[PDB]
Amino acid sequence: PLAKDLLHPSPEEEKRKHKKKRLVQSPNSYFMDVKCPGCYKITTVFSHAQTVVLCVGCSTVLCQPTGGKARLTEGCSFRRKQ
Amino acid sequence: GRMHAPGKGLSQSALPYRRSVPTWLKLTSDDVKEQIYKLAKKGLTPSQIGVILRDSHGVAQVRFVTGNKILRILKSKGLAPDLPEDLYHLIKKAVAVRKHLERNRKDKDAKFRLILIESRIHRLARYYKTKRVLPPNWKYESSTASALVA
Amino acid sequence: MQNDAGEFVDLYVPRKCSASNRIIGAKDHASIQMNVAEVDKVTGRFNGQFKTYAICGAIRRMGESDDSILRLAKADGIVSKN
Amino acid sequence: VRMNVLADALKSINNAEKRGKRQVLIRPCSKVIVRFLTVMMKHGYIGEFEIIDDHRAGKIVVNLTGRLNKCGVISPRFDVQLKDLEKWQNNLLPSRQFGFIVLTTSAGIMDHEEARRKHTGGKILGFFF
Amino acid sequence: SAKIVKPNGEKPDEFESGISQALLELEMNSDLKAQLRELNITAAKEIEVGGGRKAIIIFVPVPQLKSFQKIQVRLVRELEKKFSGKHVVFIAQRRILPKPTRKKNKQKRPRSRTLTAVHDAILEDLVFPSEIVGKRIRVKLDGSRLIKVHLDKAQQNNVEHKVETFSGVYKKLTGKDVNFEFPEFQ
Numbered sequence: 214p215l216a217k218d219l220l221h222p223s224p225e226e227e228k229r230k231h232k233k234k235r236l237v238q239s240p241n242s243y244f245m246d247v248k249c250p251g252c253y254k255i256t257t258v259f260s261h262a263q264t265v266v267l268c269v270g271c272s273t274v275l276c277q278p279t280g281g282k283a284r285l286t287e288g289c290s291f292r293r294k295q
Numbered sequence: 296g297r298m299h300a301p302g303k304g305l306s307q308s309a310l311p312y313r314r315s316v317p318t319w320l321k322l323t324s325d326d327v328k329e330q331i332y333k334l335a336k337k338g339l340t341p342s343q344i345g346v347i348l349r350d351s352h353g354v355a356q357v358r359f360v361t362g363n364k365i366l367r368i369l370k371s372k373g374l375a376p377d378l379p380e381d382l383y384h385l386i387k388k389a390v391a392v393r394k395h396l397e398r399n400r401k402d403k404d405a406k407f408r409l410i411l412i413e414s415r416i417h418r419l420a421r422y423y424k425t426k427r428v429l430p431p432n433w434k435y436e437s438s439t440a441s442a443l444v445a
Numbered sequence: 446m447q448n449d450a451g452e453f454v455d456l457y458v459p460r461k462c463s464a465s466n467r468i469i470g471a472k473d474h475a476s477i478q479m480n481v482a483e484v485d486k487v488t489g490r491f492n493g494q495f496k497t498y499a500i501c502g503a504i505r506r507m508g509e510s511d512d513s514i515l516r517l518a519k520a521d522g523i524v525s526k527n
Numbered sequence: 528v529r530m531n532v533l534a535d536a537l538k539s540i541n542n543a544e545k546r547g548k549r550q551v552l553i554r555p556c557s558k559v560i561v562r563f564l565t566v567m568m569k570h571g572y573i574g575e576f577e578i579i580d581d582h583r584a585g586k587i588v589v590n591l592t593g594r595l596n597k598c599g600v601i602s603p604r605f606d607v608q609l610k611d612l613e614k615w616q617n618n619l620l621p622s623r624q625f626g627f628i629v630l631t632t633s634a635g636i637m638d639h640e641e642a643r644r645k646h647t648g649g650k651i652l653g654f655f656f
Numbered sequence: 657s658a659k660i661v662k663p664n665g666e667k668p669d670e671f672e673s674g675i676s677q678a679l680l681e682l683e684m685n686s687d688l689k690a691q692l693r694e695l696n697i698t699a700a701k702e703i704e705v706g707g708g709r710k711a712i713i714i715f716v717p718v719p720q721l722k723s724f725q726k727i728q729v730r731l732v733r734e735l736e737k738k739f740s741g742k743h744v745v746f747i748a749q750r751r752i753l754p755k756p757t758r759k760k761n762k763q764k765r766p767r768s769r770t771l772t773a774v775h776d777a778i779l780e781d782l783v784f785p786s787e788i789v790g791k792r793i794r795v796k797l798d799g800s801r802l803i804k805v806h807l808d809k810a811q812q813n814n815v816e817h818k819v820e821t822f823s824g825v826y827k828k829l830t831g832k833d834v835n836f837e838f839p840e841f842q
Binding site: 561565568569574575576577578579581582 | 657790792793794795796797798799804
């Protein structure tokens with residue numbers, strides 16, 4: 214592999230590296246919209262969340278913090294934004 | 296690598312390229328400042344201000360929204376703490392090891408770690424006394440350290 | 446080798462590898478020079494001429510002459526063009 | 528604990544040209560190492576290089592041409608006077624016909640042949656041949 | 657054509673005979689009211705790109721550049737309607753301060769207003785509605801460097817033809833040539 218064009222990598226090779234060590238670094242996180250079942254309030258909870266996020270009015274539990282990426286509590290409506 | 300352990304861990308946050316606020320955060324610099332002004336008065340510290348408005352408000356970084364740091368808008372009208380936050384937690388952690396080490400004299404593992412914790416205080420205490428955060432006559436005394444923690 | 450008088454004072458000029466640009470020595474007996482007979486367009490047969498490419502033995506022993514001689518077939522219009 | 532970044536940059540180029548590679552990646556960039564590379568690109572040892580501008584310290588990808596023998600560094604930035612320069616030449620150049628000790632003068636990062644066209648002794652920064 | 661929308665720090669007034677009038681006139685765009693009454697521009701240049709393809713530029717006061725961002729596409733469409741054959745951009749007057757040296761009590765030059773941070777800040781408001789997702793400054797084997805700017809392709813659909821007039825205005829204002837690319841999403 215003497216001639217890997219290491220300034221224009223494929224996005225397949227770019228995806229499956231670390232979030233450091235890339236040609237230009239970028240995070241694996243995102244922000245996600247969560248419809249809790251029973252309200253208008255879309256919450257804008259972070260993907261790798263760390264706190265127990267609660268809803269404003271329908272104040273049941275929304276997500277659970279775990280190892281890397283937050284286990285959502287209820288099977289609830291959901292979309293990745295931006 | 297890791298200072299007082301033989302670790303070479305590569306695990307730290309990785310900010311994106313685009314510094315601008317995304318097109319969905321309809322939340323101005325005025326509102327995120329006054330939210331921080333509220334919940335810093337609820338016993339919080341700037342390392343745990345930005346974690347909850349990342350997780351429950353979508354603010355990826357305050358310095359991309361207000362153009363300012365969280366400890367810096369706290370100090371901007373005086374309601375930042377006296378000790379720095381990273382100095383506070385090492386002094387609190389040193390008190391807990393030293394209270395452990397009284398009842399357990401034969402715990403030589405805790406005796407070894409206590410001089411490594413106490414060194415990281417004084418290596419970081421000498422930093423803030425040259426950046427004029429701390430008074431020059433500030434000294435870490437273990438006998439009065441239990442009053443620096445609440 | 447072009448003295449100040451402007452003359453060739455040199456026994457010969459050595460070849461150099463078309464992969465790694467380094468000199469093939471006088472007794473590097475793993476260095477190949479091989480021909481690729483190109484074909485004319487309309488009838489697809491051997492037209493008489495060819496192209497030569499020299500691969501030095503140090504880059505041939507390392508195991509990427511096939512990566513090499515494809516890549517300098519890539520630059521020279523023989524391969525696929527995709 | 529990267530005490531010198533010119534030393535690390537030039538070591539990585541030197542490992543890859545003897546490996547046979549056509550491109551390197553120089554992970555921290557500085558203006559001392561882009562003016563180092565635009566002394567050997569102009570003399571013709573490397574080719575097109577891109578600076579990959581990021582918001583922390585940038586990266587550099589260099590196209591290795593193959594004409595490079597060794598691109599070492601003198602890591603204590605010794606000071607060289609123009610009386611002292613000729614004995615730095617015959618210690619760490621292979622010949623007098625080719626190769627350059629590149630050294631930082633008050634008027635810019637130069638050659639040794641360019642530096643004595645002017646009269647501007649400096650600090651020896653590295654060498655390449 | 658009036659002393660309202662164009663003030664200066666200084667006197668001179670050449671080539672604003674309709675240019676300040678052009679945004680004095682217009683009626684019922686979105687945010688008609690908070691633009692025509694209190695905001696203002698500083699200067700204007702008429703420079704050339706390509707062949708006979710001029711591009712009038714707006715020099716902007718810095719504190720209300722942020723107040724020009726949310727109206728910019730709905731002022732380009734009216735100003736290129738009126739000034740047809742012509743492109744419209746918004747650049748701040750950012751005022752380089754010189755690097756001190758060996759050669760009274762000047763407190764230190766803020767790095768927000770140094771030449772490197774200005775000549776970068778001139779980019780992302782020149783290419784305003786499509787931001788910058790990368791930069792690949794490349795030197796062309798001859799000492800001459802070249803800035804390759806990657807735009808977003810989240811807002812490609814207003815910038816397809818402006819890339820040669822962006823490069824022309826950025827070469828006159830700064831002194832260094834560029835080119836733009838539209839790379840795939842990551």
